[PDB]
Amino acid sequence: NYGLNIPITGSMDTVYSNSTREEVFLTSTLCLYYPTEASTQISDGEWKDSLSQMFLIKGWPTGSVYFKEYSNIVDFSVDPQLYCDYNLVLMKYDQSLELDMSELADLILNEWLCNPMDITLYYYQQSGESNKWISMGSSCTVKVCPLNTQTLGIGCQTTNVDSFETVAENEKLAIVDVVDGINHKINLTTTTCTIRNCKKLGPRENVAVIQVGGANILDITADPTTNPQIERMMRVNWKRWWQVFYTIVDYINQIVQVMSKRSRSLNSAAFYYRV
């Protein structure tokens, strides 16, 4: 009950000062998320310790820097648990992974509120532009069937799964947007892949997605009309992972000056599960 209604009065003259303190941990924690390809190319295994030593001179105490290895973009998109405070995610760009990278960026860079979806028993809808559905698991073959006012499937027969429309097939992660205001019947392989009704709150500003490779393709906003460039949608140019990591360490002061530690959650899950 932090009194989020009474106004706060500032002043436009006095004074530029310091931030006093905050006592819940000794200090912040930086947190790299790199693919296995970095380790394989580096061909080492004292390199995490070397990078910690090289962070120490930049001014991070030893215990603050953590490293997390993931198989690749698609295998990491499933339940991306950001166990940490200042998250960087080095995403190697690869052609045909454009929408997968956009999915992961839209998932972690923004703060989501997800409810369960019991597909077998209910139809489902979308409240507004801010409401997506997020399907995750080993294999998500999300076949939808929209229904008119009369509960007759338009372009599909509700009793014949074949007639359905496959919005996204065989994805580790799929953010699906169907038209807002029309009931749908969903069908996906509930043994492997789960699905959730996820509304989009404001942005999550612990996380910085560093596109390691090509052009600027991360379209976080599903709206085709908008395509903003966020300060955390980082992009760097690479030939070698050692060069990438060295740039990160060298410029880490700016990397954390663009983010903000405040927007953090108890659980490491990338969304608030509101049941």
Ligand X SMILES: *[C@@H]1O[C@H](CO)[C@@H](O[C@@H]2O[C@H](CO)[C@@H](O[C@@H]3O[C@H](CO)[C@@H](O)[C@H](O)[C@@H]3O)[C@H](O)[C@H]2NC(C)=O)[C@H](O)[C@H]1NC(C)=O
As for the chain, the residues directly before each break of C–N over 2.5 Å are none
- Which pair of structure tokens corresponds to residue 9? 């009065």
Q: Give me the 139-168 binding string for a copy of itself, x by CB under 8 A, dash otherwise.
A: -------x-x-----xx---------xxxx
Residue ranges in 102-141 that form contacts with ligand X under rule CB under 6 A = 119-120
What residues between 7 and 26 interact with ligand NAG by CB under 6 A? 18-19, 22
What are the backbone angles phi and psi of residue 232, rounded to the nearest 5°? Answer: -90, -10
> Under the criterion CB under 6 A, does residue 169 sit at the interface with ligand NAG?
no
Annotated binding residue 171: yes
8 A C-beta contact, residue 271 and residue 109: no
Distance CA 118, CA 190 (A): 9
Copy the structure tokens of residue 178.
Answer: 């169907």
Q: How far is the CB of 141 from ligand NAG (least distance, A)?
A: 8
Contact 80, 270 (CB under 8 A): yes
Among 89, 173, 178, 198, indicate the residue that binds a copy of itself (CB under 8 A).
Answer: 178
155 among the known binding-site residues? yes
| Among 62, 148, 163, 190, interactor with ligand NAG by CB under 6 A | 190
Question: Which of 171, 36, 41, 38 lies closest to 96, judged by CA?
Answer: 171
Q: Which of residues 205-224 bind a copy of itself (CB under 8 A)?
A: 210, 213-217, 219, 222-224
Question: Which segments are annotated as binding site for Ca(2+)?
Answer: 44, 46, 100, 103, 126, 155, 163, 165, 171, 173, 177-178, 180, 219, 221, 223, 226, 250
